[PDB]
Amino acid sequence: IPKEMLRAQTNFILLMVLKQGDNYVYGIIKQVKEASNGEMELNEATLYTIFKRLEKDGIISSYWGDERRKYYRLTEIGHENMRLRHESWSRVDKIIENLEANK
Amino acid sequence: IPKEMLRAQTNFILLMVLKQGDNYVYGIIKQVKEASNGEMELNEATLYTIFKRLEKDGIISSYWGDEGGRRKYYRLTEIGHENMRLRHESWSRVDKIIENLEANKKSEAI
């Protein structure tokens, strides 16, 4: 499994979490650890690296709670990319099914 | 849509095509366009570039076939078939994680 694929899989998971709803880093690590039955356990510094890029590209934004803790939210643009990406990957599944069909 | 994602998708179809059976560049362009009902149009020069990478990594190899004429075909190696299995398994696990994220969510509601 190539390095590019584990990065892509990690990205997909984080963005799906925020689509479930706003959340914070320590909450994101816990939720993921228990949904993989302990298999996937993310590192603080890793999430920070990925969030800097996503916030630079306008995909997510952050704000304060109880104003102590820092929350993250999927932006307007962000929701749009989720839909584009899901659509393209759906069409590919049909194409492959059809390559074998005409076969 | 990121470049790496379209790059990954084209990679994915191409390897699936060879998994259907051996093929050559023009047939690969032909076979895909008719299964996409004309929608998808692959570039020759890209395929030339993309097939070099896969052969460098031991994923595909080629041999000579007779058309009449004489054509060059491409074939998926063992290493290729094993990566196909690995790739499918990992992405199955990712789908499970997503399945459980929404369940534990609905469980907190109650």
Residue A11: DSSP 8-state: H
Q: Token pair of B65, please?
A: 């076939």
In a domain, B104, yes or no: no
Q: Which element (helix H / strand E) includes B64?
A: strand B60-65
**CB distance B8–A12 less than 8 Å?**
no
Number of domains in chain A: 1
Rg (CA), chain A: 17
Q: Token pair of A94, please?
A: 């049909």
- Residue range(s) defining the domain that contains residue B17: 3-77
Cα distance between the two ends of chain B? 37
Q: Provide φ and ψ at A56, rounded to 5°.
A: -65, -35
**B42 in A contact zone (CB under 8 Å):** no
CATH number at residue A65: 1.10.10.10
**A92 in B contact zone (CB under 8 Å):** yes
In a domain, A19, yes or no: yes
Other Cβ atoms less than 10 A from the Cβ of A69: the count is 11
Instruction: Write out chain B residues lying below 8 Å of A36, CB-based.
Output: 93, 96-97, 100
CB B9 within 8 A of CB A88: yes
* HSE of B68, CA atoms in CB hemisphere, 13 A: 0
Technique used to solve these coordinates: X-ray
Closest by CA to B38, choosing from A19, A95, A37, A70, is: A95
In a domain, A49, yes or no: yes
Q: How far apart are the C-alpha atoms of B40 and B33, rounded to whole Å?
A: 6
Q: How far apart are the C-alpha atoms of A85 and A34, rounded to whole Å?
A: 26
C-alpha distances out from residue B67 to A93, B16, B62, B63, B72, Å: 31, 23, 15, 13, 9
**A77 in B contact zone (CB under 8 Å):** no
Residue B58: DSSP 8-state: T
Q: Write a three-state SS string for B82-110.
A: HHHHHHHHHHHHHHHHHHHHHHHHHHHHC
In sequence order, the 6+-apart residues with CB closer than 8 A to the CB of A82 are A15, A19, A74
Other Cβ atoms less than 10 A from the Cβ of A27: the count is 14
Other Cβ atoms less than 10 A from the Cβ of B93: the count is 13
